[PDB]
């Protein structure tokens, strides 16, 4: 079964690997085991004879990230999420409707769009803090409260008043919530591997669609994200259907909700920890210079340290652990060739723990730089680099800047939380994010 060019191979049984996943075993240790015993950063896990090739050598990142869809294809490997977004909507939109739709989305999230996003995000953060952090001091779940701030501020930024009246952020976040109710690794991993349907979350879509479809008529009967998606064309002259606009609105809120929530929480948890006083003080040296009301230029271009804070949070504990493609034509990676039919993967989690690229990788050090160019991949790279990355950072950084200007925070355990590997998109353990707020003097 070997070819003169293939990477080293580690056989596993499906049960044995199934067991590792179901039981939420640290996936970093398993991949680091493999990287060492096979003495290669590029290596294959043969599951049921089912080849998964990992680009775990940060010097080889571009070999994963740069090829076109026709060579390394995202479609086949994410097709299981189709019920999430709908049948002809993203990874399920046939060629070339997938790239066309992602690009429409991308175009709704450029820096020309962000106009008054910042004041809008500050007002929502301050409404929240005013409604929820009312006392001189009080106890909260930081993970839960960041997620609220993330949905509220996202919807305020992206949605018009008709939308926010019919579908409030609370509602939105429930509907989103009961979808990744069926995207746990323990349940998805095996049908993802076999090529089996997603094992409830199509009921939540049909609720949204009906709701949006009403909103959508109300408007055509009578410049936000919805309105921009509604104006989108396509190469062939036709526009997106209701079903496609709903699906891309979902893909959007879905993509950014859990990832940004988690990044904000890790950032705040590191910063508040007594051993990171130096950084919190550094953070203040930067943000104490600014007025009550921030602008785009303030947050995007005059907070380099806040940004390092966010970036290193995603570096140490990236929320998307692993990014995949189907190899459609064999591809050169390092001194190996990765054959047609392989699943090829590149893992932020694995590369962000490479000792050369990120020495002492468990130390959250905001002043760190990658020691191998392009080793950091928390938002991916190349053809499929994240296109909400700028909105994400504008959002998280404004929240950090707004929350730390008014409050101090005590973490109510001794150590920063354990990541919890039981969810698809990975964050700190919920019960471990209990925190005391203290209103500034
Ligand atoms: C902190 C927040 C975020 C993180 C950490 C993050 C992380 C990532 C990563 C690792 C990828 C690589 C995908 C791959 O190679 O398969 C990606 C892509 C992508 N992201 Fe994000 N992302 C974030 C926020 C968002 C937001 C807010 C949106 C939309 C509103 C978004 C939309 C997308 C899309 C459409 C792609 C891939 C497009 C394609 O397949 O060509 N992301 N993101
Ligand atoms: O890349 C994802 C899909 N994915 C990969 N593993 C689990 N889900 C996630 N993502 C990207 N940025 C933030 N989250 C994505 C790609 C496109 C999309 F529309 C949604 C979506 F979640």
């Amino acid at each position: 079964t070997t070819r003169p060019t293939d990477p080293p191979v580690y056989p596993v049984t499906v049960p044995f690997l199934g067991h590792i996943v179901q039981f939420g075993k640290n996936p970093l240790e398993f991949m680091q085991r493999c990287k060492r015993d096979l003495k290669s950063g590029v290596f294959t896990i043969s599951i049921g004879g089912q080849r998964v090739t990992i680009v775990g050598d940060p010097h080889e990142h571009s070999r994963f990230f740069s090829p076109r869809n026709e060579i390394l294809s995202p479609r086949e490997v994410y097709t299981i999420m189709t019920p999430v977004f709908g049948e002809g909507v993203a990874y399920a939109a046939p060629y070339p409707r997938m790239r066309e739709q992602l690009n429409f989305l991308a175009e709704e999230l450029t820096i020309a769009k962000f106009q008054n996003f910042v004041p809008a995000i500050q007002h929502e953060v301050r409404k929240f803090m005013a409604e929820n952090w009312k006392e001189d001091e009080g106890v909260i779940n930081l993970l839960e409260d960041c997620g609220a701030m993330i949905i509220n501020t996202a919807c305020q930024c992206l949605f018009g008043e008709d939308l926010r009246k019919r579908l409030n952020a609370r509602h939105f976040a429930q509907l989103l919530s009961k979808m990744e109710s069926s995207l746990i690794p323990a349940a998805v991993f095996m049908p993802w591997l076999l090529r089996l349907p997603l094992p409830r979350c199509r009921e939540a879509r049909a609720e949204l669609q009906k709701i949006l479809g009403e909103i959508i008529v109300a408007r055509e009967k009578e410049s936000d994200l919805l309105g921009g998606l509604l104006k989108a064309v396509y190469r062939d002259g036709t526009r997106m259907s209701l079903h496609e606009v709903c699906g891309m609105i979902v893909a959007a809120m879905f993509a950014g909700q859990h990832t940004s929530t988690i990044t904000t929480s890790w950032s705040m948890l590191h910063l508040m920890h007594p051993k990171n006083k130096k950084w919190l003080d550094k953070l203040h040296k930067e943000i104490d210079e600014f007025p009550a009301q921030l602008n785009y230029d303030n947050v995007m271009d005059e907070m380099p340290f806040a940004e390092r804070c966010v970036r290193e949070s995603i570096r140490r504990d990236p929320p998307l652990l692993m990014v995949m493609r189907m190899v459609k034509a064999e591809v050169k990676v390092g001194s190996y060739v990765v054959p047609k039919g392989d699943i090829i993967a590149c893992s932020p989690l694995l590369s962000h723990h490479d000792e050369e690229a990120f020495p002492n990788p468990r130390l959250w050090d905001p002043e760190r730089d990658e020691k191998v160019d392009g080793a950091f991949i928390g938002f991916g790279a190349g053809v499929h680099k994240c296109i909400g990355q700028k909105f994400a950072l504008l959002q998280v950084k404004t929240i950090l800047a707004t929350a730390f200007r008014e409050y101090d925070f005590q973490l109510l355990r001794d150590e920063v939380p354990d990541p919890d590997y039981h969810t698809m998109v990975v964050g700190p353990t919920l019960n471990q994010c209990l925190v005391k707020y203290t209103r500034k003097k």
Side-chain angles (χ1 to χ4, degrees), residues 2-28 30-110 112-114 117-130 132-134 136-164 166-177 179-180 182-189 191-193 195-199 201 203-219 224-238 240-274 276-331 333-384 386-440:
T2 54
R3 302 157 196 80
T5 41
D6 34 54
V9 171
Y10 194 90
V12 290
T13 224
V14 5
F16 169 96
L17 188 61
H19 188 255
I20 285 156
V21 175
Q22 293 181 122
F23 278 52
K25 262 26 194 216
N26 187 330
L28 178 64
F30 168 66
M31 299 187 288
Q32 289 193 312
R33 213 164 292 125
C34 299
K35 192 182 173 170
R36 299 180 199 279
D37 297 350
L38 306 177
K39 15 226 284 94
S40 177
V42 184
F43 63 87
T44 296
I45 305 152
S46 172
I47 312 172
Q50 202 169 140
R51 284 167 60 94
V52 179
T53 293
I54 300 186
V55 188
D57 179 334
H59 299 266
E60 299 303 318
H61 281 173
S62 42
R63 304 298 196 177
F64 180 85
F65 294 101
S66 303
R68 290 177 290 155
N69 287 358
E70 294 78 7
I71 308 292
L72 302 185
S73 180
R75 179 184 273 96
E76 291 77 16
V77 290
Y78 297 117
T79 207
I80 211 185
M81 300 172 63
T82 296
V84 179
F85 310 127
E87 279 294 359
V89 169
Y91 295 121
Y95 167 85
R97 301 169 71 72
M98 170 179 72
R99 62 188 84 188
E100 285 194 71
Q101 300 169 3
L102 291 175
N103 195 69
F104 301 153
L105 180 46
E107 297 185 331
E108 294 312 312
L109 305 176
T110 64
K113 299 293 170 172
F114 302 175
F117 276 21
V118 172
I121 119 92
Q122 279 197 306
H123 186 53
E124 293 295 319
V125 166
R126 302 201 215 260
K127 255 169 88 354
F128 188 91
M129 297 192 328
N132 300 278
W133 309 350
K134 200 130 10 59
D136 288 43
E137 77 190 329
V139 171
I140 71 184
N141 191 112
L142 181 78
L143 222 219
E144 283 190 57
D145 287 10
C146 283
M149 281 181 274
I150 291 290
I151 189 98
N152 296 3
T153 58
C155 292
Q156 180 66 34
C157 280
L158 303 166
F159 296 140
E161 232 259 302
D162 54 330
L163 200 310
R164 280 185 325 259
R166 278 145 122 343
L167 174 41
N168 59 225
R170 196 123 116 183
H171 207 184
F172 217 142
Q174 274 115 51
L175 309 196
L176 275 173
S177 176
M179 288 199 293
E180 30 176 14
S182 263
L183 260 155
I184 41 176
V188 290
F189 184 82
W192 166 82
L193 223 207
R195 291 168 281 196
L196 256 34
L198 213 248
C201 101
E203 90 168 59
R205 196 260 313 134
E207 201 177 330
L208 264 138
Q209 187 161 141
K210 199 203 80 210
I211 287 168
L212 294 180
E214 291 152 19
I215 299 164
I216 295 190
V217 183
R219 281 209 188 183
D224 67 345
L225 159 75
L226 168 56
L229 282 171
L230 245 29
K231 261 149 197 153
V233 171
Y234 276 128
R235 306 165 172 182
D236 78 4
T238 63
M240 289 192 299
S241 72
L242 169 58
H243 178 69
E244 295 175 338
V245 178
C246 166
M248 288 296 100
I249 293 171
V250 191
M253 296 305 300
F254 182 85
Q257 178 56 218
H258 210 193
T259 64
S260 310
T261 292
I262 280 180
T263 308
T264 313
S265 309
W266 280 128
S267 287
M268 294 187 70
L269 292 155
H270 294 294
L271 286 164
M272 78 179 68
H273 198 278
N276 292 334
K277 212 262 186 281
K278 173 180 42 176
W279 311 125
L280 174 64
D281 289 343
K282 232 142 153 101
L283 177 72
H284 278 286
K285 191 155 101 284
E286 177 173 275
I287 74 182
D288 288 341
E289 230 25 54
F290 301 105
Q293 303 322 125
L294 302 176
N295 63 213
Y296 174 89
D297 308 320
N298 293 317
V299 168
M300 274 313 311
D301 294 297
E302 311 186 55
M303 302 177 195
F305 186 78
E307 175 141 330
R308 281 180 167 274
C309 282
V310 178
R311 202 147 265 272
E312 170 71 354
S313 286
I314 300 176
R315 199 274 319 154
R316 187 185 100 130
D317 298 295
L320 308 189
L321 306 185
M322 179 104 57
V323 118
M324 293 90 77
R325 312 285 192 254
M326 179 76 30
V327 181
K328 285 262 165 170
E330 71 186 8
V331 76
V333 187
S335 65
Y336 302 123
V337 166
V338 183
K340 197 190 204 288
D342 272 25
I343 304 174
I344 191 172
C346 189
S347 160
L349 182 65
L350 189 48
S351 310
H352 294 175
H353 294 76
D354 183 282
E355 218 98 71
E356 179 185 350
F358 304 101
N360 202 10
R362 289 319 291 173
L363 181 75
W364 178 89
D365 174 0
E367 276 185 341
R368 158 191 308 284
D369 301 313
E370 64 191 3
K371 290 308 178 210
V372 172
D373 294 319
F376 167 91
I377 53 156
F379 295 104
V383 174
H384 307 277
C386 177
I387 45 93
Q389 142 185 38
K390 312 231 67 146
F391 175 80
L393 286 167
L394 183 91
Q395 195 179 37
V396 176
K397 283 172 47 150
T398 309
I399 281 168
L400 301 183
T402 306
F404 277 107
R405 148 197 244 284
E406 322 230 48
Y407 289 86
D408 279 300
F409 294 98
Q410 188 192 23
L411 178 51
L412 296 181
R413 76 193 296 280
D414 303 323
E415 304 299 337
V416 169
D418 301 316
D420 172 358
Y421 295 111
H422 271 107
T423 56
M424 173 107 287
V425 169
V426 183
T429 305
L430 179 63
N431 81 270
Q432 284 172 30
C433 301
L434 209 67
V435 159
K436 187 160 103 324
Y437 70 84
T438 297
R439 189 82 136 270
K440 251 145 151 33

